[model samples]
Target chain A: LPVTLSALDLGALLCSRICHDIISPIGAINNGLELLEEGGADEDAMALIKSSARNASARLQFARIAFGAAGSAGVQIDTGDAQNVATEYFRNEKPEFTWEGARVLLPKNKVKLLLNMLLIGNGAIPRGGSLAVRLEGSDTDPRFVITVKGRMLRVPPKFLELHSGAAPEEPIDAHSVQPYYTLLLAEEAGMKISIHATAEDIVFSAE
Target chain B: SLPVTLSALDLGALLCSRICHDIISPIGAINNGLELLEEGGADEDAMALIKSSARNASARLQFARIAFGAAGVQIDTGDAQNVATEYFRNEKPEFTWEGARVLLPKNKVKLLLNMLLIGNGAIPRGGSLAVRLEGSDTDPRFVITVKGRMLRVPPKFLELHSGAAPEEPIDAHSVQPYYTLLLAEEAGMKISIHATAEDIVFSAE
Candidate 1:
C-alpha cells in the first residue's frame, strides 16, 4: 500500500486543491460580471470588474497548459503563446522576470516543463529578486538555463530527492509537489539537470 | 508503441481539468443568481432561479468531490447513484443505473461516473443514457449506451479510447475524452467507443 502511495499519487489531490483555489476567486469575478450583464453597474466599478475578470481568464488560460490539459502530445508549442502566459502569470509575482531566449518554441511537454520550472523558480526566490530564463541553440537542439538571484534564496531539500528518483523518508505534501512533478517531466524529456544554490542565488540547468 | 505510462503527476492535471469542466457551469449559474439578488430587488422568478441554481451547484460539487477526489477501497453504491442521478436531473439527456446497489470501491464508482459523463457528451441534442454494469467491484465492466438522433462522437474520443494521442491538440473542450482513457487504463480497464448513424455506445472494463 505504501508502495502504491509512494508514487507521485499526491499530485491529483494537489491539482484538485490548486483548481479549488483558482476557481473560488474566479467564481467571485463571475458574480461581478453577472451583475453587469444582468443588471447595471457604474462606469468606475465596471473597469475594476473587467480587469479582475480579464486577470482570471488569463490565469485560466495559463493554467490550461501549465497545469491542465491544453496541448497535443509530441507537438511544438508556440513561443508567442508561451511568452504571453509567462508574462501574464508573472506580472503580479514577487520576483522580476527576464526572458532571455524569446524566440525558441519548445515541444508541448517541454513548455509544460519550462512553465513548471518557473513555478519552482517562483518559490526559489523568497526575498523578491531577479529571475532570468535563457535558451541556447536552435529549436532542434535547444538548451535551457534558469537562474534566480535573491537575498534569501535556497532550494528545498525534498526537490533534489524527488527530482532524481531518490525518495525522501518523509511523505511528500501538496505545497511542494509541483517541483517534483516538474522534475519528472524534465527527466522524461531526457534532461540531465543540475540545481545549484547558495546564500545568494539558485541556478537550474537542463540540456 | 505500447501505452505510455503517465506518472501520477500527469494524472493529477488531467483529473483536475475534468473536475473543473463539470463544476464550472453550475457554479456560473449560482454566481449569476447571487449577483442578481445582490444588485437589489429580487423578483419571485429570480428567487426560483437562485434556489434551483444553488441546488444544482451543490449537487455537482458533492458528486465531483466523491468522483474526482482521492479514495481508498470501497464506496456506497447508493451514494454514487444519488450523486450521478442528481447531476443529470436537469439535463437534456436521461440517466439510469441498472447495476445492483452494493458497497464498492471508490474507483468503481469513479469509473461509472466517468463512463456516464463521456456518454453524456456523445448526446449533445437530447438522448437517453443507460449504464449497465457486470461483475464484482474488483472486476467491474461498464457498457454505457447513448441513444439519440444526430448522435456525434469526436475522433479524439476514439483516439483516447484506443490508447493513442489525440490527432489535434486537446483544449479544455477536448480534454475530457483524452483524460477518460487515461483514467480507465489507470484502473486496469479498457474503453472503446462505437458510433453509427443511429447510436453512440461506450464500452469499458
Candidate 2:
C-alpha cells in the first residue's frame, strides 16, 4: 500500500523531508547574519556568523548528494564526494566513521543508500561507537558492507522493520520514515540489503 | 491515464526547485537588508522592508510545512486558511476563501492546497482565486475559480484532465497539477476547467 502513493506525492514528501533539514540551519544563518550586522564583527559574533554559514553550506552539500540525482552519471558517482558528504554530515555526531574503501568511484544510488544506512547506524551508537564503511571490488564490480559497532547500542525497531520490508503494523511518521525511503532507493538501485543486529552492534551488508 | 511513476532523482529535483523558488528572494533580502543596515542606512522604509521580508519568508516556510511536510496530526482548516492567506500575501495574484470552516483531514487539506496551486497556474497574469469546498463529511468536493484579464492555460494539463496521457515527465511545476488530477480521478471525481475572456473556473467533484 505504501507504494501505491502517486509518484508526485511521494516526491513532494521526500523533498519536504530534506527541506525540513535545511530550514533550521538556514534560519540560523539568517539570525546569525542579522546579529553580526548589529555587533559589527566582534569575535563572538563573527564566530557565530562563520559557524552558521558552515552549517548551511555543509548541509546543502550533503543534501545535494543524498537527495539529488547523485549516482546517475552513467550510474556511477565519485567516491571522494560520497565520502566527503558523509564525513561532513557525521562530523558533529557521537559515533566515529572509518571509510575503508579504495579511491575509485561507486554506484550513485547505492552510495546514497549506504550513507542513509550509515546515518541510521550512527544513531544506533548512542554512547558513541565506531562505524566502518568498507567497499571492495573494482569500479566494474562493487560491494559495500557497513558495520555500526558500539556499546549500549540500540537499533530503532521501526527502522529495522521498514528496512527489511517488514511493516511495523503501525504508522510510520517523520521520525521513522528514513529507513523506508532508503530501502526504496536501495531496491531501485538493484541492491539487496540485509540487516543484522546484536546487543552491541548493527550490521548492514549489500550486494 | 496518469503519468508514469516519478524516479527518486526527478522528484528530488522538483522539491529542490520549488523550495528554492519560494525562499531565494527572502534570503537575498536578508543579505541585502542587513548589509544596508550595517552601513547606517537608517530609515523607516529600509527597516520596514527588512521586517516584512523576514515575516514573508517565515510565512512561506509555515505554509509549506503543511502543504509539503507530512503532518503527524490533523491540520485545522481555519489555520489552513490563515496560512494560505499569509503565504500569498505579496506574491502577485490574490486569494479569497469560501471553503467550509470545518476541520478537514490533513491529506485532504494538502490535496486542496495542491489543487489551488494548479488553479493559480491557469491565471498567469496576476488573477484572483476563489476557493470553495462543499460536501458532506466523508465526501469532499473542491471548487476553485480563477479570474483575471488574461489567462494562459497549459495545453497538456487540459488534455490530461480531460483524461489520457501515457507518457509525460513531472517536473518541478507540473508535478502538483498532474498529481492532483490523479487524486481527482481516483476519487471517481471529474475535474472541470472552463476558461474565457477574463475567467477560469477549475473544480473537482
Candidate 3:
C-alpha cells in the first residue's frame, strides 16, 4: 500500500525526484559556464547561462513550496505568489498554464497539493498542452478545478490506483511518487479529489 | 523498535525540504552572480563565484542522485569517488578513497556513500576519512576509518547503525542514520561501528 511504504524509502525517493528534476538545468548551467570559459562569455553561452539559471531557480522555488514544508506550521500561503512562481516554472515546459482563479490565502498543504497536481497534469500531457486552473465553491471555502486539455490525454494508471484509495500492488518509486504524494496531500488537507478523463480532457477537481 | 512515529508523507516532505534548503544557497548565489553580470559587472570575481557555485550545485545534485536514488544498476568506483570527492571538497573532512577502480552494484556504492556521510558526521570538527574495500570486486566490503581532533559520536549512533530502533523521536538531523540502517538491511549487509576517543570506524559487509 502507498501509505504503508516505509518513511525512509519514501523520503529517499522524494529527494531523488527533486534532484532528478533540477540536475538537468543545473548541469546546463555548468555547461554554459564551460562554454564561457572556453570562449570568453560569448553571446550564445551567456544566453544559455542566464536561461538555465532562471530555469533552475524557478524549479527550486516551486519544489520548495510544492514538496518541501513551506512556512511554519499553520501558515497560509499567498495564492498570488504561488501563481507567479508556478507561472515562471511552466514557461520553459511543454504546457501552457493559466490561472483563472481569484487570489486567496490557502493552507500550506492545500497549496502544495495544488502545485503537485499541476505537475501531474504537466506530466500527463507530454506532447504539449494547456492546464487551466480555476476556483469553485464559496469564498470562505473554495475548491480547485484544473481542466487539462491536450491531443491525447489519458490519466495514468497509477493515478487511478491512488485516486481510488486502494492499497498499491507494486512498490512506489521516484516516478510514481507524484500521484502518491498528491493523494497524500489531498488526505492531509481534508480534501476530496476526483479525476474525470475523456478523449480530449482530464479534469482534476478538489473540494 | 524506533521510539517515534513519522508518517511517510511527512518523512518525504522533510527530505525534500532538506534538499531544497541545501540547493537554495548555491542557486541563490548563481542568481546573484547573474544579476551582477546583467548589470555589466561581469567581473572576474563574479564569474568565478558563478562557476564555482554552479560546480558545487551540480556536484551535490549528482551525489544525491546516486546516494538517495533507486539502486539496481552498476556504478563505477572511480566515478562514484569523483562525485564524493567533489561533494566533500569544501567540507571540513579530508576524505580519501583508497580502493582500486571497479564497477560495483549501485546499492553497494550507495551504502558506501551513506557510510561516508555517517563517518563524516562522527567527526564534526574536521577530520580525516580513509575509505577502502576488503574482499573481491564482485563481493566487496566497505571499511571507513574516521579520525579527528574532537570525535564525538552522536548519541545512539551505534545502536542506530546496527539496525536498532532509535531511542528518541527522529527528525531531519537523525533521520539520516536511520536511512543508513535501512540501506544496509536492504542490501543484506551488516554494519559494525567501533569508536575510540580519537577515532570512529565504520565497516559494512
Candidate 4:
C-alpha cells in the first residue's frame, strides 16, 4: 500500500519538484559555459558560452521567488530592490514587464510559490505581452491572487495536464516538464490552488 | 545671438543617461513577479510566462551592466520583466497589456536598448519582433520571437561583433548597425544569434 501524504510531506515534495524543474536548465547553462571555455577563445564559441551562462542566471533569479526565497513573514522588500529587479527583467528585454501593485513584502512561502506561478503565466504569452499580480491577505488567513491577461496565451499541453493532476508517465524530462514542484509546494504549505484558463485570460488563486 | 550646439559625444552621453534613468520602474515589475512567486497561487502557464519574461529582462540587465560599467553583481529573473516592459514601450507598436508586476536586474537595461536598435536597423520598413524570457530561476534564458512582413538580418552584421569581419565596414548610416560591435568591445560580453524566415531569436544565457 502507498503511504498517505500529509500536508508537510506534500509541501516538501512540491519543493523538490520545483527544484528539479529549475536545476536542469541551470546546470545546462553552467555546462555550456564550461564547454565554451574548453573550446578555446573563439568569438562564436564565447557567444554560445555567454548565452548559456545568461540563461542559467536568469532561471535562478526567477526561481528565487518561484521557490520561495525572496519573501519573509511581514518582511517588506525595499522599494528600490523591487523596482530595480522588475525593470531589469521585463523592460530591459523583448517581452516587457509591467507593474500592477504597490510595493510590499508578503509571506516568504507565498512569495516563492506565486513567483513560480507567475513565471508560468508569463510564458503563456508568446508575443510580447503583459501580466498583472495582486495581493490580498490578512495575518490569520492570507490570500494571493494573480491574473494573467494577454493578447496571446501559449500554455504548453503538458503543463496543462500537470495542472489537472493527469501528468503523463514520462521521465519528467525537459520536453514534457510542468510545474509539478509548485503544486507539491502549495499542498505542503496548506495552501489551495485554483486555475482558470480561457482564450482571453489565465487566472490562478491561492489561499 | 549665440546658441549652444551639442556634439556627438554629448548627445551620446545624454541619450545613454536618459535610457538608464527611465528603465528603473520596469525592474520593479520583475520584482513583483518574484513577489507573486513567493506569495504562490499562480497557474503553471502563468509561471512559465513570468519566468520567460524575467529571464529576458535579466539578460538585458546583464548586458547593460557590462556595457555601461554599472556596479551590479548579477541579474535575477524577478527583474527581467520590468526591464523588458520599458524596452518594449520604446520600440514596439502600442500594446494593451496585463500582468505588469515582475522583478528584473539593473544590468539588462543597456542590452535591450542595443537589441532594439539592432532590430530597428534590420527592419527599415518596420516589422514586429516578439521577445520573451524562458526557463526557471535555476535555469534562466531569453527567447526573442519575431513575426513580420519582411525581416532582413544580415549575416555579416550578426557575425561582426564576435571578431568576424563584415563584407565591408559596418553600415554606420544608422547607429544600430555598428552598435553590436561597439557593445561587444565595450562590455566584453558575447551575444548569441538564431534566425529564421519570420523569426529571430536572440538569447543571452
Which model scores highest in TM-score? 3
Give TM-scores of the second chain, every candidate: 0.82, 0.80, 0.79, 0.45
Between candidates 3 and 4, the one scoring higher on TM-score is: 3
Best by DockQ: 3
Clash number for every model? 2, 1, 0, 134
Model 1 agreement with the true structure over A63-182: per-residue lDDT tens digits: 667766555443667666777788876775788888877566677777777777887787777777888888776687667778999877877666766765676676554555666667
DockQ per model, Cα: 0.25, 0.24, 0.55, 0.01
Best by lDDT: 3
RMSD of each: 6.6, 4.8, 4.0, 23.4
In model 2, where do residues sit more than 4 Å from their true spots? Answer: A1-16, A19-23, A26-57, A64-81, A95-108, A129-132, A147-152, A163-166, A194-203, B7-57, B72-75, B148-150, B162-168
Model 3 Cα lDDT, one tens digit per residue, A1-207? 245556666777788889888878898888987797799668889789889888988888888778876553535877787888789999888888899887888888888888888887887787878988887676466688888888868777788887777877787888888788888788888888888888879998888
Give one digit per residue, the lDDT tens place, for model 4 in A128-197.
Answer: 5667666566644556566666677767455566767674655343233225545654665578778777
What is the lDDT for A76 in model 2?
73
Candidate 2 achieves a global lDDT of 0.67
Model 3 misses residue B187 by how many Å? 5.2
Q: What's the TM-score of each model vs. the native? A: 0.66, 0.76, 0.82, 0.36
- lDDT (Cα, tens digit) per residue for candidate 3, span B49-96: 888888778877877777766544688878778878989996789988
DockQ of model 3 vs. true complex: 0.55
DockQ of 4: 0.01
For model 3, which pairs clash? none
